[PDB]
RNA sequence: AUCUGCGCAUGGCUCAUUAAAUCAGACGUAAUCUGCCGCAAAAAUCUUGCGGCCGCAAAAUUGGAUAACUUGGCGAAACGCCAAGCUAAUACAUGAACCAACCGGGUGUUCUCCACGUGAGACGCCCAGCGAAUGAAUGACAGUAAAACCAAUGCCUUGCAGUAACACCCAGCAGUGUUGACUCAAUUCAUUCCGUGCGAAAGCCGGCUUGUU
């Protein structure tokens, strides 16, 4: 079947390699997952040694981490907005490592309110900072003293969608985990998205 | 209130995908003090063994190279070789020559032979044609590349 | 995987005749490396002569009459190796597998309270789950809580019956060692110095009792005592002293003529 | 009986090799330095059994002991250790009500939720310990123990350290 | 009902042969947990809990050794500072 | 006889292909997979039986199927085949509370106290096993000497000598993994694992002294 060997390749001299053996199972490749955005569907793959890879065909949710807050939440995948390989992967809503996605910002907004006592949804189920023990208020002040959130993420939370980068490999593990874009990386990709509306 | 994030450096980011180090987070609001250089920026660097000094460009530079042995996960193990730079026309890759004399027993005499090796060159070196370099064996980095430049003499 | 072992391909130290059989017993995986081990069947049939052939060797071994490190081993393909203690309680036999000056395996007879002690060279040190320090020895043993001063290359003298470490001898200059590999295998000497070549093989320079200086790779040395005077284990008859070949031939000839 | 070259095995109960021959009163040891165990004929028999032999992993010499059994430092002492008095929740005035009637010389609190009280009489310290051990104070179960410390040594140290404090102040 | 004797009601088939004593074939009862089996099952849990508690004891001894060594170094340092 | 478990990827044969291939000596895999064999590790789990989710009790007395076999058999034959009826396993599936520990994280608009909140202590609640995934922090230091100010906090007594750290039940229950070099070993925090993982095989056999350890 599909092979990964260098036998079919040309030599650096440009000569043709004369193959004198049949293909081996130890050098095989598999067809790509081509994971798309949709309701969860996975297919186990028995790999060498009896271990199983999880070939995800469709994924809709994953663990997305806020690095500066050192937290993570299970959130819904809303859209795929940018892919550095080609825009056809964006058009087909393919999920691969390092692609840029938009995920639901509600769990991150709610955690901020619970952990810092700051409700980002000012000026308009939902945690209320008023119902807090006086000890929790003091811990809120202690956490809030050495803390500065960036406006770019803060604005994205307000709109309900926040951009993130996939950090896992859905074709190998069957997961769509990621990390929220921050700082210069967010500004880079915001400029890429700003190009052509 | 609000956090002052670092700005995009256009001199480095021209690859259609954001260039970054995988070992560290450059956006960390509180630097860990472990991987901070003299300029205050966060930059991953490691010491390779065998008594090789990590170049200052690696320590306090701005380049992003996932194949550099001083700022990435590429490790040096196996053979350590010396050679002469033969060509620098590729991006981050150089061709070196190893000239040597081969002995022929029947005639009790030598002949001049040479071998060519494709070697990855980190942006921290900048060697020229005719320069002498020290190269360390690493994992396969391309179809032909098996060595990384360690020192330019 | 490979299940057979041609007799020509078998280690020469097993002393199996090239004309008697096509195959030799292939050692199973286990405590010692295949090239650096003595199979139990070879020990029971070719060395101890208790078994005339393999079928009698199977008779002895399957009954658990042969103990290795205070544990009956019923497989003739079990890979017994260096410093192992082999005991047959029925015949009252107790010996340690060691190397003589010529590099061959030797059955050095042991007394009681000596068969309970075995030396193990630490080959690796790692951390297990729960932050538990683990030492891996030359015979495949894993020690769950070694001495905090233990280092790679050191030797742990270990009570087999009670399954506990009782002492540690560090790998330093001036210590007595025995060579376990190479052309110098079986020689006993004192560490003069160790040359360090990072990323390559360290070289240990040793000096025996007679003053002869020799060398080998650091992986082939095995610390066995504080110095040459006080060893922590019984050694073979020749005491690890290489002897000049011309003088050895002359002494054997004189001894033969004295006999006749 | 006195034993030379005790070696390792500092555990007092690990000296039961003498306990095998006859009962042991106390064992005072200093690891490899020495070890003394604490009728007379039985000790002599244990001397013949263990001396000049590598027992317990080292050569032990059971010599007759010229040292009396060590006195417990807790006995005849005028200081008491009290737990779990919590300083952030209890004031010194409320602490003294626990000691009311007994009368004290000195009171000190520490961050480990324990207090040291120096009483005037060893009998007062002994009576307080026996009648207040396992009692209830300030919403917690109490724990009082006779302390081997002494107030006269602390005052001597304070006088000796005052000179250093004054000299460093002038420095 | 439970606690009854299942061995009493097993089906026995009679085999008749001329000159033979009419062997009565009955099966061997499976999953018949005897008091011996109950003891064997209970011993497994006893050994398992004993082993983990033994490991905790070894962990305690090793931690004590490390802590005591650091304590000895600390107070030796204090003694040297005072003695000079 | 037949289910189950292991092997049949070894041996034996041959030399057609094959020149940056194969092979030899010498090295690498920190770029990985690895049954059998050796030495080790294992505290996740709401189960069962009698009565009405609740109570009492504890050596867990778990559940469905399918071979051989029986019946009817198809087919010229086929290391070819149906259908029905039985019954097992260390096959397959399910599932074990208390006994039984140490440790941590988040909290209650809950109590008992101190000062007028880097306060303390309890109880209540949700998580806290191996392995796996993502993110965060560790995985060391090793290029200089003295003084004051304030806030809190340690001692000393009612101002800093002395002082490993730590608000009790543990006053030393890791301040210290490894390599030549690691994003590795390992630990802590957050979130996750949906079958593509994890029984004490709910297993077998002996010895006596016959043993709800
Ligand atoms: K089968
Ligand atoms: K033939
Ligand atoms: K378990
Ligand atoms: Mg059964
Ligand atoms: Mg073959
Ligand atoms: Mg070779
Ligand atoms: Mg449990
Ligand atoms: Mg027919
Ligand atoms: Mg099974
Ligand atoms: Mg883990
Ligand atoms: Mg370290
Ligand atoms: Na190496």
PDB file of C-alpha atoms (C1' of nucleotides) in Angstrom, chain F:
ATOM      1  C1'   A F   1     -13.687 -35.179  20.689  1.00  0.00           C
ATOM      2  C1'   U F   2     -14.096 -29.920  21.069  1.00  0.00           C
ATOM      3  C1'   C F   3     -13.755 -24.719  23.048  1.00  0.00           C
ATOM      4  C1'   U F   4      -9.609 -21.949  25.447  1.00  0.00           C
ATOM      5  C1'   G F   5      -4.178 -20.340  25.790  1.00  0.00           C
ATOM      6  C1'   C F   6       0.752 -20.355  23.106  1.00  0.00           C
ATOM      7  C1'   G F   7       3.423 -21.318  18.551  1.00  0.00           C
ATOM      8  C1'   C F   8       3.421 -21.714  13.300  1.00  0.00           C
ATOM      9  C1'   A F   9       7.160 -14.056  11.313  1.00  0.00           C
ATOM     10  C1'   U F  10      11.743 -19.639  13.756  1.00  0.00           C
ATOM     11  C1'   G F  11      13.968 -23.520  11.150  1.00  0.00           C
ATOM     12  C1'   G F  12      14.886 -25.614   5.938  1.00  0.00           C
ATOM     13  C1'   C F  13      15.711 -24.073   0.725  1.00  0.00           C
ATOM     14  C1'   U F  14      17.495 -20.907  -3.031  1.00  0.00           C
ATOM     15  C1'   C F  15      20.796 -16.715  -5.156  1.00  0.00           C
ATOM     16  C1'   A F  16      16.594 -14.307  -9.449  1.00  0.00           C
ATOM     17  C1'   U F  17      16.891  -9.294  -8.283  1.00  0.00           C
ATOM     18  C1'   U F  18      20.668  -5.751  -6.477  1.00  0.00           C
ATOM     19  C1'   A F  19      26.445  -0.552  -7.004  1.00  0.00           C
ATOM     20  C1'   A F  20      24.971   6.742  -2.486  1.00  0.00           C
ATOM     21  C1'   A F  21      21.573  -0.702  -2.888  1.00  0.00           C
ATOM     22  C1'   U F  22      23.275  -4.894  -0.133  1.00  0.00           C
ATOM     23  C1'   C F  23      27.460  -5.931   2.961  1.00  0.00           C
ATOM     24  C1'   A F  24      32.063  -5.332   6.324  1.00  0.00           C
ATOM     25  C1'   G F  25      34.388  -2.795  10.363  1.00  0.00           C
ATOM     26  C1'   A F  26      32.879   1.241  13.235  1.00  0.00           C
ATOM     27  C1'   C F  27      29.010   4.269  15.141  1.00  0.00           C
ATOM     28  C1'   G F  28      23.922   6.514  16.295  1.00  0.00           C
ATOM     29  C1'   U F  29      18.213   6.365  17.606  1.00  0.00           C
ATOM     30  C1'   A F  30      17.667  12.247  22.838  1.00  0.00           C
ATOM     31  C1'   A F  31      13.644   9.788  16.022  1.00  0.00           C
ATOM     32  C1'   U F  32      11.132   4.857  17.654  1.00  0.00           C
ATOM     33  C1'   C F  33       8.108  -0.240  18.336  1.00  0.00           C
ATOM     34  C1'   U F  34       9.205  -4.358  21.187  1.00  0.00           C
ATOM     35  C1'   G F  35       4.755 -10.820  22.918  1.00  0.00           C
ATOM     36  C1'   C F  36       7.582 -14.698  25.377  1.00  0.00           C
ATOM     37  C1'   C F  37      11.962 -13.914  29.723  1.00  0.00           C
ATOM     38  C1'   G F  38      14.295 -11.067  34.481  1.00  0.00           C
ATOM     39  C1'   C F  39      13.708  -7.583  38.531  1.00  0.00           C
ATOM     40  C1'   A F  40       9.723  -4.385  40.198  1.00  0.00           C
ATOM     41  C1'   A F  41       5.205  -1.317  40.938  1.00  0.00           C
ATOM     42  C1'   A F  42      -0.504  -1.563  42.431  1.00  0.00           C
ATOM     43  C1'   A F  43      -4.970   2.235  48.509  1.00  0.00           C
ATOM     44  C1'   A F  44      -9.290   5.084  41.550  1.00  0.00           C
ATOM     45  C1'   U F  45     -14.166   2.215  41.271  1.00  0.00           C
ATOM     46  C1'   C F  46     -21.374   2.226  45.682  1.00  0.00           C
ATOM     47  C1'   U F  47     -20.872  -4.436  44.963  1.00  0.00           C
ATOM     48  C1'   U F  48     -23.900  -8.256  47.267  1.00  0.00           C
ATOM     49  C1'   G F  49     -27.870 -10.493  50.616  1.00  0.00           C
ATOM     50  C1'   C F  50     -32.506  -9.980  53.435  1.00  0.00           C
ATOM     51  C1'   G F  51     -37.123  -6.363  54.567  1.00  0.00           C
ATOM     52  C1'   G F  52     -39.982  -1.630  53.546  1.00  0.00           C
ATOM     53  C1'   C F  53     -35.107   5.388  47.510  1.00  0.00           C
ATOM     54  C1'   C F  54     -34.871   3.822  52.999  1.00  0.00           C
ATOM     55  C1'   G F  55     -33.292   0.245  56.999  1.00  0.00           C
ATOM     56  C1'   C F  56     -30.410  -4.010  58.691  1.00  0.00           C
ATOM     57  C1'   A F  57     -26.059  -7.111  57.486  1.00  0.00           C
ATOM     58  C1'   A F  58     -21.035  -8.412  55.123  1.00  0.00           C
ATOM     59  C1'   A F  59     -15.667 -14.611  53.423  1.00  0.00           C
ATOM     60  C1'   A F  60     -19.424 -11.124  47.119  1.00  0.00           C
ATOM     61  C1'   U F  61     -23.084 -18.049  46.621  1.00  0.00           C
ATOM     62  C1'   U F  62     -22.665 -12.566  39.335  1.00  0.00           C
ATOM     63  C1'   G F  63     -24.983 -12.979  33.912  1.00  0.00           C
ATOM     64  C1'   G F  64     -26.044 -14.403  28.751  1.00  0.00           C
ATOM     65  C1'   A F  65     -24.161 -17.268  24.808  1.00  0.00           C
ATOM     66  C1'   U F  66     -21.392 -20.988  21.820  1.00  0.00           C
ATOM     67  C1'   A F  67     -18.467 -25.795  20.617  1.00  0.00           C
ATOM     68  C1'   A F  68     -18.031 -31.010  21.122  1.00  0.00           C
ATOM     69  C1'   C F  69     -22.895 -33.939  21.310  1.00  0.00           C
ATOM     70  C1'   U F  70     -28.288 -34.882  19.544  1.00  0.00           C
ATOM     71  C1'   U F  71     -31.949 -34.296  15.416  1.00  0.00           C
ATOM     72  C1'   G F  72     -33.130 -33.094  10.361  1.00  0.00           C
ATOM     73  C1'   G F  73     -29.765 -32.692   6.778  1.00  0.00           C
ATOM     74  C1'   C F  74     -27.887 -30.103   1.402  1.00  0.00           C
ATOM     75  C1'   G F  75     -24.185 -31.454  -2.188  1.00  0.00           C
ATOM     76  C1'   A F  76     -21.048 -35.715  -7.766  1.00  0.00           C
ATOM     77  C1'   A F  77     -17.228 -33.695  -5.056  1.00  0.00           C
ATOM     78  C1'   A F  78     -14.910 -29.734  -2.304  1.00  0.00           C
ATOM     79  C1'   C F  79      -8.758 -28.634   4.430  1.00  0.00           C
ATOM     80  C1'   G F  80     -17.425 -27.585   1.128  1.00  0.00           C
ATOM     81  C1'   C F  81     -21.826 -26.394   3.675  1.00  0.00           C
ATOM     82  C1'   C F  82     -27.175 -25.053   6.246  1.00  0.00           C
ATOM     83  C1'   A F  83     -31.395 -25.163  10.440  1.00  0.00           C
ATOM     84  C1'   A F  84     -33.064 -26.607  15.208  1.00  0.00           C
ATOM     85  C1'   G F  85     -32.275 -28.602  20.184  1.00  0.00           C
ATOM     86  C1'   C F  86     -28.548 -29.158  25.040  1.00  0.00           C
ATOM     87  C1'   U F  87     -24.161 -27.811  28.227  1.00  0.00           C
ATOM     88  C1'   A F  88     -18.696 -25.606  30.186  1.00  0.00           C
ATOM     89  C1'   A F  89     -14.399 -22.585  30.711  1.00  0.00           C
ATOM     90  C1'   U F  90      -8.412 -19.083  32.766  1.00  0.00           C
ATOM     91  C1'   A F  91     -13.863 -18.066  26.087  1.00  0.00           C
ATOM     92  C1'   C F  92     -17.238 -13.412  26.492  1.00  0.00           C
ATOM     93  C1'   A F  93     -19.708  -9.915  29.637  1.00  0.00           C
ATOM     94  C1'   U F  94     -20.587  -7.605  34.331  1.00  0.00           C
ATOM     95  C1'   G F  95     -18.904  -6.161  39.117  1.00  0.00           C
ATOM     96  C1'   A F  96     -17.045  -5.471  44.325  1.00  0.00           C
ATOM     97  C1'   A F  97     -19.183  -0.550  50.092  1.00  0.00           C
ATOM     98  C1'   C F  98     -16.661  -0.567  55.122  1.00  0.00           C
ATOM     99  C1'   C F  99     -12.085  -2.516  56.710  1.00  0.00           C
ATOM    100  C1'   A F 100      -8.103   1.365  54.173  1.00  0.00           C
ATOM    101  C1'   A F 101      -3.543   5.693  54.942  1.00  0.00           C
ATOM    102  C1'   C F 102      -0.615  10.325  53.599  1.00  0.00           C
ATOM    103  C1'   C F 103      -0.992  14.663  50.485  1.00  0.00           C
ATOM    104  C1'   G F 104      -3.308  19.036  47.534  1.00  0.00           C
ATOM    105  C1'   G F 105      -6.784  22.588  44.723  1.00  0.00           C
ATOM    106  C1'   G F 106     -11.419  25.390  44.498  1.00  0.00           C
ATOM    107  C1'   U F 107     -15.309  27.122  47.590  1.00  0.00           C
ATOM    108  C1'   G F 108     -19.922  28.211  51.597  1.00  0.00           C
ATOM    109  C1'   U F 109     -23.163  34.856  50.257  1.00  0.00           C
ATOM    110  C1'   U F 110     -22.083  28.392  57.307  1.00  0.00           C
ATOM    111  C1'   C F 111     -20.412  28.788  62.408  1.00  0.00           C
ATOM    112  C1'   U F 112     -16.728  29.865  66.821  1.00  0.00           C
ATOM    113  C1'   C F 113     -12.829  33.681  67.976  1.00  0.00           C
ATOM    114  C1'   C F 114      -8.994  38.134  67.572  1.00  0.00           C
ATOM    115  C1'   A F 115      -8.180  43.307  65.441  1.00  0.00           C
ATOM    116  C1'   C F 116     -11.392  47.282  63.993  1.00  0.00           C
ATOM    117  C1'   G F 117      -8.870  42.650  58.064  1.00  0.00           C
ATOM    118  C1'   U F 118      -1.602  39.360  53.521  1.00  0.00           C
ATOM    119  C1'   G F 119      -6.791  37.378  60.336  1.00  0.00           C
ATOM    120  C1'   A F 120      -7.108  32.280  62.675  1.00  0.00           C
ATOM    121  C1'   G F 121      -9.693  27.572  63.547  1.00  0.00           C
ATOM    122  C1'   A F 122     -13.705  24.232  62.560  1.00  0.00           C
ATOM    123  C1'   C F 123     -17.668  22.032  59.808  1.00  0.00           C
ATOM    124  C1'   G F 124     -20.343  21.610  54.783  1.00  0.00           C
ATOM    125  C1'   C F 125     -19.882  21.050  49.482  1.00  0.00           C
ATOM    126  C1'   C F 126     -17.084  19.762  44.433  1.00  0.00           C
ATOM    127  C1'   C F 127     -12.738  17.644  42.970  1.00  0.00           C
ATOM    128  C1'   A F 128      -8.169  15.079  44.019  1.00  0.00           C
ATOM    129  C1'   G F 129      -5.249   6.550  41.608  1.00  0.00           C
ATOM    130  C1'   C F 130      -1.919   4.282  37.221  1.00  0.00           C
ATOM    131  C1'   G F 131      -1.691   5.587  32.095  1.00  0.00           C
ATOM    132  C1'   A F 132      -3.125   9.339  28.102  1.00  0.00           C
ATOM    133  C1'   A F 133      -4.139  14.727  25.879  1.00  0.00           C
ATOM    134  C1'   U F 134      -3.523  20.293  25.964  1.00  0.00           C
ATOM    135  C1'   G F 135      -1.910  24.579  28.698  1.00  0.00           C
ATOM    136  C1'   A F 136       0.923  26.739  33.021  1.00  0.00           C
ATOM    137  C1'   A F 137       5.027  26.189  36.689  1.00  0.00           C
ATOM    138  C1'   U F 138       9.392  23.365  38.441  1.00  0.00           C
ATOM    139  C1'   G F 139      13.424  20.312  36.752  1.00  0.00           C
ATOM    140  C1'   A F 140      18.794  24.855  40.514  1.00  0.00           C
ATOM    141  C1'   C F 141      22.787  28.485  42.044  1.00  0.00           C
ATOM    142  C1'   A F 142      27.831  29.085  41.002  1.00  0.00           C
ATOM    143  C1'   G F 143      30.683  38.079  37.955  1.00  0.00           C
ATOM    144  C1'   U F 144      30.303  43.342  44.864  1.00  0.00           C
ATOM    145  C1'   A F 145      30.362  45.289  50.050  1.00  0.00           C
ATOM    146  C1'   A F 146      27.599  47.911  54.008  1.00  0.00           C
ATOM    147  C1'   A F 147      23.377  51.394  55.857  1.00  0.00           C
ATOM    148  C1'   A F 148      18.784  53.224  56.728  1.00  0.00           C
ATOM    149  C1'   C F 149      12.494  54.350  55.228  1.00  0.00           C
ATOM    150  C1'   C F 150       7.587  52.317  55.201  1.00  0.00           C
ATOM    151  C1'   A F 151       3.751  47.971  55.180  1.00  0.00           C
ATOM    152  C1'   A F 152       3.178  43.259  56.964  1.00  0.00           C
ATOM    153  C1'   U F 153       5.560  39.243  59.492  1.00  0.00           C
ATOM    154  C1'   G F 154       9.229  36.454  62.763  1.00  0.00           C
ATOM    155  C1'   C F 155      11.712  36.474  67.449  1.00  0.00           C
ATOM    156  C1'   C F 156      13.574  39.770  72.490  1.00  0.00           C
ATOM    157  C1'   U F 157      11.225  42.241  76.388  1.00  0.00           C
ATOM    158  C1'   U F 158       6.982  44.768  78.168  1.00  0.00           C
ATOM    159  C1'   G F 159      15.224  46.483  69.366  1.00  0.00           C
ATOM    160  C1'   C F 160      17.470  42.970  66.061  1.00  0.00           C
ATOM    161  C1'   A F 161      20.866  38.355  68.597  1.00  0.00           C
ATOM    162  C1'   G F 162      19.362  33.846  66.786  1.00  0.00           C
ATOM    163  C1'   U F 163      16.934  32.086  62.888  1.00  0.00           C
ATOM    164  C1'   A F 164      16.273  25.139  57.774  1.00  0.00           C
ATOM    165  C1'   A F 165      11.385  25.867  56.352  1.00  0.00           C
ATOM    166  C1'   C F 166       6.208  25.391  58.003  1.00  0.00           C
ATOM    167  C1'   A F 167      -0.079  29.117  61.999  1.00  0.00           C
ATOM    168  C1'   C F 168      -1.110  22.326  66.020  1.00  0.00           C
ATOM    169  C1'   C F 169      -2.248  17.049  65.957  1.00  0.00           C
ATOM    170  C1'   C F 170       4.693  14.875  61.192  1.00  0.00           C
ATOM    171  C1'   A F 171       8.571  21.037  66.230  1.00  0.00           C
ATOM    172  C1'   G F 172      13.773  17.345  59.321  1.00  0.00           C
ATOM    173  C1'   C F 173       7.216  12.904  56.392  1.00  0.00           C
ATOM    174  C1'   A F 174      12.962  15.166  49.748  1.00  0.00           C
ATOM    175  C1'   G F 175      15.090  22.921  49.996  1.00  0.00           C
ATOM    176  C1'   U F 176      18.867  17.992  46.242  1.00  0.00           C
ATOM    177  C1'   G F 177      16.192  12.937  39.226  1.00  0.00           C
ATOM    178  C1'   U F 178      19.512  12.048  35.008  1.00  0.00           C
ATOM    179  C1'   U F 179      22.874  12.841  30.881  1.00  0.00           C
ATOM    180  C1'   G F 180      28.199  15.364  27.625  1.00  0.00           C
ATOM    181  C1'   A F 181      23.649  17.547  26.159  1.00  0.00           C
ATOM    182  C1'   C F 182      17.217  17.111  26.640  1.00  0.00           C
ATOM    183  C1'   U F 183      10.926  20.403  25.605  1.00  0.00           C
ATOM    184  C1'   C F 184      13.669  13.880  28.883  1.00  0.00           C
ATOM    185  C1'   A F 185      12.629  11.211  34.369  1.00  0.00           C
ATOM    186  C1'   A F 186       9.481  12.973  38.072  1.00  0.00           C
ATOM    187  C1'   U F 187       6.186  16.572  40.811  1.00  0.00           C
ATOM    188  C1'   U F 188       2.332  20.523  41.358  1.00  0.00           C
ATOM    189  C1'   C F 189      -2.071  23.392  39.066  1.00  0.00           C
ATOM    190  C1'   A F 190      -6.332  23.743  35.266  1.00  0.00           C
ATOM    191  C1'   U F 191      -9.370  21.024  31.851  1.00  0.00           C
ATOM    192  C1'   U F 192     -10.127  16.501  29.439  1.00  0.00           C
ATOM    193  C1'   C F 193     -10.365  10.500  28.190  1.00  0.00           C
ATOM    194  C1'   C F 194     -17.241   7.893  26.381  1.00  0.00           C
ATOM    195  C1'   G F 195     -13.786   2.504  24.194  1.00  0.00           C
ATOM    196  C1'   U F 196      -9.635   3.156  21.212  1.00  0.00           C
ATOM    197  C1'   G F 197      -6.819   1.298  28.373  1.00  0.00           C
ATOM    198  C1'   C F 198      -6.462  -0.655  33.755  1.00  0.00           C
ATOM    199  C1'   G F 199     -10.506  -7.842  37.959  1.00  0.00           C
ATOM    200  C1'   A F 200      -8.430  -9.505  43.648  1.00  0.00           C
ATOM    201  C1'   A F 201      -9.186 -13.518  36.195  1.00  0.00           C
ATOM    202  C1'   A F 202     -15.816 -13.824  40.553  1.00  0.00           C
ATOM    203  C1'   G F 203      -9.360 -18.603  38.050  1.00  0.00           C
ATOM    204  C1'   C F 204      -6.505 -23.642  39.089  1.00  0.00           C
ATOM    205  C1'   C F 205      -3.825 -27.225  42.106  1.00  0.00           C
ATOM    206  C1'   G F 206      -1.476 -28.883  46.639  1.00  0.00           C
ATOM    207  C1'   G F 207       0.197 -29.444  51.886  1.00  0.00           C
ATOM    208  C1'   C F 208      -0.869 -30.336  56.638  1.00  0.00           C
ATOM    209  C1'   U F 209      -2.208 -28.803  62.110  1.00  0.00           C
ATOM    210  C1'   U F 210      -8.411 -28.647  58.340  1.00  0.00           C
ATOM    211  C1'   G F 211      -7.802 -22.970  59.530  1.00  0.00           C
ATOM    212  C1'   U F 212     -15.298 -16.225  58.266  1.00  0.00           C
ATOM    213  C1'   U F 213      -6.530 -13.767  58.508  1.00  0.00           C
TER     214        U F 213
END
